[PDB]
């Protein structure tokens, strides 16, 4: 038979369910950034967990070990590109100081709010899912899309929508027609 | 010290000693002897199906007082005879003799549950319909 397709699980569940102090901290993030699930938080903390595991491992290696040089530089370079880590803090020891809010701040859903365009993080989510936002030429409709530092110049309304320059939507057209027809009465 | 050999070539004695002492662990002994195949009503399966022989009431152990409702069942694969609890009170109206039922463990890994002396299994389905669906009036039992 054909070779197996590989797949993997992307989140982890907190090991004590009813730790009351934790429940409060999670709900503030969801209200601040307009998330729909706790899973959206678990996903981020799962990624952050693995980054620390790798970084902490490398720090056992001596400086000028060729592996620490090669892979350590890759990891730092890759986080700077998305803007999670400042290019001032461009050193491996600072990777251990990142926290969840550093990643949520970079989601397309929040960037479309900080730029204007929308007027709440709840309004921003609606526009993305309804296909009004484009990055460069490509229409994007996923809220969790991580905006790389180059792309921020190119976020704007899509060419093929109202707000972007196309024809009015289905409901505006219906209203104009009935009123025009009645105005002929 | 510590009453166990430490020497660098002593490996044979250490491992042999460990084997002899694992037989005191209770669940370990069950696997190696294969006890769940040779005995216990389910042959190591999580469920079994059986036929209802008669209807019973079982009074609670102290301090409580209540005649709790149970049935005798005979398992189809083993022919062994067992007593099972029926949840949700008035659901006892849905079970009658020569019904076929699906049984599950009563949650305590072969021990009886709570007040009830010697009752280890609970009914899950009757005649192919679930008791929970009957209790909530979601389905209907065809007679036989």
């Amino acid at each position: 038979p054909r070779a197996p397709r590989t797949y993997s699980k992307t989140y982890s569940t907190p090991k004590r369910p009813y730790e009351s102090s934790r429940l409060d901290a999670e709900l503030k993030l969801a209200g601040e950034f307009g998330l729909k699930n706790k899973k959206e938080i678990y996903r981020i903390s799962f990624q952050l967990s693995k980054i620390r595991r790798a970084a902490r491992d490398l720090l056992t290696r001596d400086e000028k070990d060729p592996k620490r040089l090669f892979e350590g530089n890759a990891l730092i370079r890759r986080l700077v590109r998305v803007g999670v880590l400042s290019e001032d803090k461009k050193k491996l020891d600072y990777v251990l100081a990142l926290k969840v809010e550093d990643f949520l701040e970079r989601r397309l859903q929040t960037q479309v709010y900080k730029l204007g365009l929308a007027k709440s993080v709840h309004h921003a989510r609606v526009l993305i899912t309804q296909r009004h936002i484009a990055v460069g030429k490509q229409i994007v409709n996923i809220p969790s899309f991580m905006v790389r530092l180059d792309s921020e110049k190119h976020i704007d309304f899509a060419p093929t929508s109202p707000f972007g320059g196309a024809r009015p939507g289905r409901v505006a057209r219906r209203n104009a027609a009935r009123k025009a027809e009645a105005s002929g009465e | 010290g510590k009453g166990k050999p430490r020497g660098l070539n002593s490996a044979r004695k250490l491992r042999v000693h460990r084997r002899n002492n694992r037989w005191a662990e209770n669940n370990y002994k069950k696997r190696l002897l294969g006890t769940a195949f040779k005995s216990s009503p389910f042959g190591g399966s999580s469920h079994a199906k059986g036929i209802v022989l008669e209807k019973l009431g079982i009074e609670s152990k102290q301090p409580n007082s209540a005649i709790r409702k149970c049935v005798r069942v005979q398992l189809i694969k083993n022919g062994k005879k067992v007593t099972a609890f029926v949840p949700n009170d008035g659901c006892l109206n849905f079970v009658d003799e020569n019904d076929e039922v699906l049984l599950a463990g009563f949650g305590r890994k072969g021990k009886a549950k709570g007040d009830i002396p010697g009752v280890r299994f609970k009914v899950v389905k009757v005649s192919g319909v679930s008791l929970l669906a009957l209790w909530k009036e979601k389905k209907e039992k065809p007679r036989s």
Binding site: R131, A134, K137, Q138, I139, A158, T160 | -
Partner: protein, 130 residues
């Protein structure tokens, strides 16, 4: 709006008397472009007969506006007719669909014939006499 056609990664392939390339199409404000229209515009730009042009395998970008596919142009109508798969020629109407029986029926006929030795003009006569 005007359609724009572009070709990329152009290879000349003397071993099969053809040119082969990527076809890239921009088409704002319409759903897509038909293969039949692409075949015409490619024919006049490469100065070929329309029957020597073959085009397949398109998909259109998410959010629309662009499509990408693959294209061939043969050095003659005769050479196209020998190297091209028959199913593509049917799409272009350069060949006629053959009318064989269903796959299960053909197999069952074969197994009946295996039971006859020789041509079977005899035996038929013997059965007629019975």
């Amino acid at each position: 709006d005007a359609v724009t056609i572009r070709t990329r990664k152009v290879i000349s392939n003397p071993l099969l008397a053809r040119k082969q390339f990527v076809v890239d199409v921009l088409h704002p404000n319409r759903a897509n472009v038909s293969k039949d229209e692409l075949r015409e515009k490619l024919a006049e730009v490469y100065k070929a007969e329309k029957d020597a042009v073959s085009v397949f395998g398109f998909r259109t970008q998410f959010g629309g506006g662009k499509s990408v596919g693959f294209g061939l142009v043969y050095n003659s109508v005769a050479e196209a007719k020998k190297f091209e798969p028959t199913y593509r020629l049917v799409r272009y109407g350069l060949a006629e669909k053959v009318e064989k029986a269903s796959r299960q029926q053909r197999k069952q006929k074969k197994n009946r014939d295996k039971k006859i030795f020789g041509t079977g003009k005899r035996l038929a006569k013997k059965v007629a006499r019975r």
